[PDB]
């Protein structure tokens, strides 16, 4: 034969041959279904064997799914694994685990090897499973994320194993193996990146923060050492586990350092600020000077958080600490950083903070400060509200001068109400 | 250059060697003869010419040119061999930071610790020369958290009246902050 | 943090009285490491630069 469609002619020749013997019963249908390798036809011989008239081939599932599923390694192995998947002869499952065709692949032989380990779990469980885990455990030297993912998958199958004695021993040794060597040998990965996989194996071994126990007091430091530099997918759950095992200020400071070095800007540092306030209240003591010193020290310059918070945590915490002096200082220093986006929220929070404390003169200083900072409508609305509030209380000099200030600002647009209201207020 | 322009190489070497042994202190004769040997092969007689060129004690411009010559043919052992006599002549900080170059070439781990011992015991005993520990902490930040806390803040006995100028102290602080394990 | 507090506070005074004070304070404590931050030789020098402008704009958060 030269090329494809010859095994299709022999295929249909076996379709008219549908019973060619009294023994194998037209084995040339499956033999034709095994023709070539992949990516040619592969549907002609199986489609003919099932196309005789109709009954069911029961062969064509493993025969069509037995020819190179997953170029090289790929999802095509599931196609060859689909025919008689739970049981056929209790044989072709090995062909489902049979892939070979060595080539460049990442994660496919490991995931298909874990699925083959599940087929080994239906094969009698521990029989042949440990040999598959040990054979697939070593591929080159590290430098792959599929290795620790397959070992962690074996750890999940060990979680399906009920009692955690042997699962904790094998998961303890297999989880302790990456501790010596992790990744970054050769490949396209510039760094090792052992935080994800290594922290996943260490988390599956101990300190799951959900159900499984047997987490030593040093297991949290074993996870933080498993990341070995910084990791913060779990920083909230990791700090929560360290708080569950300890609940002291050392875990709070270690969570603040791990959150600061974790990722720049308030990404994990915002969670370090929430855990810094909650840990400041529940550990460092209520109304503590060191809590405000550290909270104001870490968040000092800052970018504008999510939207912005430079104040309410430290400003409200300082106002509720029992000191009416430093509350005003934190109100002015918080007023400088109040609204980097020029939002009226922080403006009304500063004007309200000056309204509930001090008195008139503070509202006048907040009126001049609110009129100093201007974006578009900020100085007009603030100067108008403080102008009416000052005219309803003080003399009419601040109303006339506030009107002259309202002439230089508040571009005309439509308006017209402020001029008539100011004229009526001057008439009154 | 006239005898080099022609195809006669034997009389060329016979005039080049007496030229360079007559006038050792000039650089251009040795430079153009070694460049003619760049046009020629890489035989060990070139290395004999280069070790004679090391023997007359020239400036930095010759010596780091010869180590670039050793780099452009991928020599690991011999370039390490010729570089031990380099530091004992010129104690320049530009050469103190570049004696620690096998770190950025081979990563040299245990002998990198030995080279960093050599960087910490020599001159700059109480004043640090304000530049060596910058590159030391730079490579140690390129490495893990082995001994990076000690050198910048805890080995502060060798300060120069403020331990640093204003231009780099907060840079030291943010150099320590966001490149660690980042614990809570 | 002391460094950020002295930076923030010094920046505030220099923000109100003008940069003429930055020079005074810098030359008045040039040998004193408590003010080393005012020179470009310190790591937080860049942080302070922002604080001055910020206090002038009247938007920053005063200390506590």
UniProtKB/Swiss-Prot annotation, chain A:
N6-acetyllysine: modified positions: 135
Keywords: Acetylation, DNA damage, DNA repair, mRNA processing, mRNA splicing, Nucleus, Phosphoprotein, Repeat, Spliceosome, Transcription
HAT repeats: 84-122, 213-245, 247-281, 286-320, 358-392, 394-428
One GO process term, biological-process aspect: blastocyst development
Oligomer and partners: Associates with RNA polymerase II, the TCR-specific proteins CKN1/CSA and ERCC6/CSB, and XPA. Identified in the spliceosome C complex. Component of the XAB2 complex, a multimeric protein complex composed of XAB2, PRPF19, AQR, ZNF830, ISY1, and PPIE. Identified in a pentameric intron-binding (IB) complex composed of AQR, XAB2, ISY1, ZNF830 and PPIE that is incorporated into the spliceosome as a preassembled complex. The IB complex does not contain PRPF19.
Protein family (similarity comment): Belongs to the crooked-neck family.
Protein name per the record: Pre-mRNA-splicing factor SYF1
Source organism: Homo sapiens
Gene name of this polypeptide: XAB2
Swiss-Prot record, chain B:
Transmembrane segments: none
Tissue spec. comment: Widely expressed. Highly expressed in testis. Not detected in brain and lung.
Subcellular compartments: Nucleus; Nucleus speckle
Source species, domain of life: Eukaryota
HAT repeats: 7-39, 41-72, 74-105, 107-142, 144-178
Subunit structure: Identified in the spliceosome C complex. Present in a spliceosome complex assembled in vitro containing CRNKL1, HPRP8BP and SNRPB2. Component of the minor spliceosome, which splices U12-type introns. Isoform 2 seems to be predominant in the spliceosome complex. Interacts with PPIL2 (via the PPIase cyclophilin-type domain); they may form a trimeric complex with HSP90.
Protein function: Involved in pre-mRNA splicing process. As a component of the minor spliceosome, involved in the splicing of U12-type introns in pre-mRNAs.
Entry's family note: Belongs to the crooked-neck family.
Name this polypeptide is given: Crooked neck-like protein 1
Range covered out of full length: 284 to 467 of 848
From Swiss-Prot, chain C:
SURP motif repeats: 6-48
Cell location: Nucleus; Nucleus speckle
Impact after mutating residue 2 to F: SLURP 1 motif acquires binding to SF3A3
Tissue: Ubiquitously expressed.
Leader sequence residues: none
Subunit structure: Component of the 17S U2 SnRNP complex, a ribonucleoprotein complex that contains small nuclear RNA (snRNA) U2 and a number of specific proteins. Part of the SF3A subcomplex of the 17S U2 SnRNP complex which is composed of three subunits; SF3A3/SAP61, SF3A2/SAP62 and SF3A1/SAP114. SF3A associates with the splicing factor SF3B and a 12S RNA unit to form the mature 17S U2 small nuclear ribonucleoprotein complex (17S U2 snRNP). SF3A1 functions as a scaffold that interacts directly with both SF3A2 and SF3A3. Identified in the spliceosome 'E' complex, a precursor of the spliceosome 'A' complex.
Task of the protein: Component of the 17S U2 SnRNP complex of the spliceosome, a large ribonucleoprotein complex that removes introns from transcribed pre-mRNAs. The 17S U2 SnRNP complex (1) directly participates in early spliceosome assembly and (2) mediates recognition of the intron branch site during pre-mRNA splicing by promoting the selection of the pre-mRNA branch-site adenosine, the nucleophile for the first step of splicing.
The protein, known as: Splicing factor 3A subunit 1
Portion of the full-length sequence here: 47 to 110 of 793
């Amino acid at each position: 034969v030269m090329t494809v469609r010859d095994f299709t002619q022999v295929f249909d020749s076996y379709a008219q041959f549908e019973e060619s013997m009294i023994a194998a019963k037209m084995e040339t249908a499956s033999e034709l279904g095994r023709e070539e390798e992949d990516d040619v036809d592969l549907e002609l011989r199986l489609a003919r064997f099932e196309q005789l008239i109709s009954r069911r081939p029961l062969l064509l599932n493993s025969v069509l799914l037995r020819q190179n599923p997953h170029h090289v390694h790929e999802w095509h192995k599931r196609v060859a694994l689909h025919q008689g998947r739970p049981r056929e002869i209790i044989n072709t499952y090995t062909e489902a685990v049979q892939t070979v065709d060595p080539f460049k692949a990442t994660g496919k032989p490991h995931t298909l090897w874990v699925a083959f380990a599940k087929f080994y779990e239906d094969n009698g469980q521990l029989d042949d499973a440990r040999v598959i885990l040990e054979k697939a455990t070593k591929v080159n030297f590290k430098q792959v994320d599929d290795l620790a993912s397959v070992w962690c998958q074996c750890g999940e199958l060990e979680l399906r194993h009920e009692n955690y004695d042997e699962a904790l021993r094998l998961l303890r040794k297999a989880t302790a193996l990456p501790a010596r060597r992790a990744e970054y040998f050769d490949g396209s990965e510039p760094v090792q990146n052992r935080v994800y996989k290594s922290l996943k194996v260490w988390s599956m071994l101990a300190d799951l923060e959900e159900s499984l126990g047997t987490f030593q007091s040093t297991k949290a430091v074993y996870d933080r050492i498993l990341d070995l530099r910084i990791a913060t997918p779990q920083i909230v759950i990791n700090y929560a586990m360290f708080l569950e095992e300890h609940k002291y200020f050392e875990e709070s400071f270690k969570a603040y350092e791990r959150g600061i070095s974790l990722f720049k800007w308030p990404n994990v540092s915002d969670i370090w600020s929430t855990y810094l306030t909650k840990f400041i209240a529940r550990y460092g003591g209520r109304k503590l000077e060191r809590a405000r010193d550290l909270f104001e020290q870490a968040l000092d310059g800052c970018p504008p958080k999510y939207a912005k918070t430079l104040y309410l945590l430290y400003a409200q915490l300082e106002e509720e600490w029992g000191l009416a002096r430093h509350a005003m200082a934190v109100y002015e220093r918080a007023t400088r950083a109040v609204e980097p986006a020029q939002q009226y929220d922080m403006f009304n929070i500063y004007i309200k903070r000056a309204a509930e404390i001090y008195g008139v003169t503070h509202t006048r200083g907040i009126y001049q400060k609110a009129i100093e900072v201007l974006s578009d409508e900020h100085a007009r609305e603030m100067c108008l509200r403080f102008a009416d509030m000052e005219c309803k209380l003080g003399e009419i000099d601040r109303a006339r001068a506030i009107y002259s200030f309202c002439s230089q600002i508040c571009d005309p647009r439509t308006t017209g109400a402020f001029w008539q209201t100011w004229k009526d207020f001057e008439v009154r | 250059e006239m005898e080099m322009k022609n195809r006669q190489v034997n009389h060329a070497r016979n005039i080049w060697d007496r030229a360079i042994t007559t006038l050792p202190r000039v650089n251009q004769f040795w430079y153009k003869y070694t460049y003619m040997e760049e046009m020629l092969g890489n035989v060990a007689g070139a290395r004999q010419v280069f070790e004679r060129w090391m023997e007359w004690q020239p400036e930095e411009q010759a010596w780091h040119s010869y180590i670039n010559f050793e780099l452009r043919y991928k020599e690991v052992d011999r370039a390490r061999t010729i570089y031990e006599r380099f530091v004992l002549v010129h104690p320049d900080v530009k050469n103190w930071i570049k004696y620690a170059r096998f770190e950025e070439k081979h990563a040299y781990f245990a002998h990198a610790r030995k080279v960093y011992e050599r960087a910490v015991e020599f001159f700059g005993d109480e004043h640090m020369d304000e530049h060596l520990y910058v590159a030391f902490a730079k490579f140690e930040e390129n490495q893990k958290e082995f001994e990076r806390v000690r050198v910048i803040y805890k080995y502060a006995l060798d300060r120069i009246s403020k331990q640093d100028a204003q231009e780099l102290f907060k840079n030291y602080t943010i150099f320590e902050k966001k490149f660690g394990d980042r614990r809570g | 943090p002391e460094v950020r507090n002295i930076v923030d506070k010094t920046a505030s005074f220099v923000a109100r009285n003008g940069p003429e004070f930055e020079a005074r304070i810098r030359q008045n404590e040039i040998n004193n490491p408590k003010f080393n931050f005012l020179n470009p030789n310190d790591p937080y020098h860049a942080y302070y630069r922002h604080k001055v402008s910020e206090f002038k704009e009247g938007k920053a958060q005063e200390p506590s």
